[PDB]
Ligand binder design. Structure first.
Ligand code: TDC
Ligand code: TDC
Ligand code: CL
Ligand code: CL
Ligand code: CL
Ligand code: CL
Ligand code: CL
Ligand code: CL
Ligand code: CL
Ligand code: CL
Ligand code: MG
Ligand code: MG
Lengths: 203, 203
């Protein structure tokens, strides 16, 4: 079929959902596209190049809150940005693992620069704004990775529990992690605000 | 050589540092131990069983702050627990990925139950204490995963930056992520405290 970049991404994403990240291979991608492996090689040099591209295109296509709305507070931005990033990560099987393979790509530079500048325009130093943005990113990624690895590990093998842990798993599995994620997100934001408003005061 | 459980773990950990998680195989483990693959199979049924065991033994051996000190505050416990968990995760190549393969194992039940009970004894509901413990876990795991994947991806391929991002990478690479981790950790803890002390007040 067609092997323009967009079409190759479409197929690779379709394949990722079928196989997961570990099981995705350029050989399987060539099969899905109806082509020979050396043909695919002209377009996609190896799995790593493919994964790097997926990490970018997943956010380009499905992360709709990269940028603040006009007039938006930094708090509200971090909240909306996190919710969007989580959704985009969860959209594809092993999505968090796909993301983590790389740091910002050149096509992402303008976006992430704008985010860093936005925090500095709202009273943060570059360093403290980077600390906040990174903390949100890492908390979000960790939460998704946990969900997605539990989905995986369930396919290899199943799972005398003590009472609070029993209850905690029952609670942690009453939704897809969303309550825990949102509650932690608010805690994080509030801690950043306390820190910011403190200025040079001992806090 | 010897194939008691302890000795197999020792060798597998040694191998993990040599290969990383994706490149670790039971075939390579059998080679390191000087044995045939069917011999190893009697002891270790597959890679997943091996990884599950490593996730547990890495913490048993190297996470020394599972439990609070007598009289310790919940804040100080979460801090010390996080620092220890991070160190243990960072100790082995792809350690965060090793951890994420599983939820608490039976040999961990008493430990994690004690942690959940400890939060409830310090004013949290089980749910809100679980929210805090999970948030710390996920933030810590996300931060480590980012560091460890950057170490990996560097071996496949290297890396016009805009100025804040340039500076952010220079800042994010001035240590091994420790400043960013510790600053986020304090933000998280403080947000949990604000929430706890609020009780039923609009906050
Ligand atoms: C600023 C920054 C970001 C990211 C990142 O990986 C990163 C880094 O690895 C080093 C230095 C800075 C950054 C994000 O991945 C990203 O997810 C992202 O690419 C991004 C985006 N593309 O819109 C975001 O929304 C951000 N958000 C989750 C806080 C965050 C921004
Ligand atoms: C309570 C709990 C924990 C963990 C966990 O995975 C988990 C879960 O998957 C479902 C429900 C509850 C928990 C931890 O991994 C763990 O890392 C852990 O095993 C653990 C430990 N073994 O000492 C911890 O130190 C904890 N800390 C990082 C907050 C955390 C505790
Ligand atoms: Cl074509
Ligand atoms: Cl195209
Ligand atoms: Cl491949
Ligand atoms: Cl707002
Ligand atoms: Cl033996
Ligand atoms: Cl033993
Ligand atoms: Cl294997
Ligand atoms: Cl204390
Ligand atoms: Mg990133
Ligand atoms: Mg865990």
């Amino acid at each position: 079929s067609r092997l323009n970049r967009e079409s190759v991404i479409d197929a690779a994403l379709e394949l990722l959902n079928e196989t997961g990240i570990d099981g995705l291979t350029t050989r399987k991608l060539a099969q899905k596209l109806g082509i020979e492996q050396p043909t695919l090689y002209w377009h996609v040099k190896n799995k790593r190049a493919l994964l790097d591209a997926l990490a970018v295109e997943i956010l380009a296509r499905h992360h709709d809150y990269s940028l603040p709305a006009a007039g938006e507070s930094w708090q509200s931005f971090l909240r909306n940005n996190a919710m969007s990033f989580r959704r985009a990560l969860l959209r594809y099987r092993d999505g968090a693992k796909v993301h983590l393979g790389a740091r910002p790509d050149e096509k992402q530079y303008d976006t992430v620069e704008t985010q860093l500048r936005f925090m500095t325009e709202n009273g943060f130093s570059l360093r403290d704004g980077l600390y906040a943005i990174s903390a949100v990113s890492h908390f979000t990624l960790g939460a998704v990775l946990e969900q997605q690895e539990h989905t995986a590990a369930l396919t290899d093998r199943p799972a005398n529990l003590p009472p609070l842990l029993r209850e905690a798993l029952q609670i942690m599995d009453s939704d897809d992690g969303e309550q825990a994620f949102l509650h932690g997100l608010e805690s994080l934001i509030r801690g950043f605000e306390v820190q910011l408003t403190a200025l040079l005061q001992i806090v």
